Amino acid sequence: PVFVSVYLNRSWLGLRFLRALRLIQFSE
Numbered sequence: 001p002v003f004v005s006v007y008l009n010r011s012w013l014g015l016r017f018l019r020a021l022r023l024i025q026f027s028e
Contacts, residue, residue: 004023011020
């Protein structure tokens, strides 16, 4: 655990919410 929240958190500002928005919306 704490492996997705850390990757979906830094991605929010790491890629203007693009690096995470593609990982949180891909699962559907």
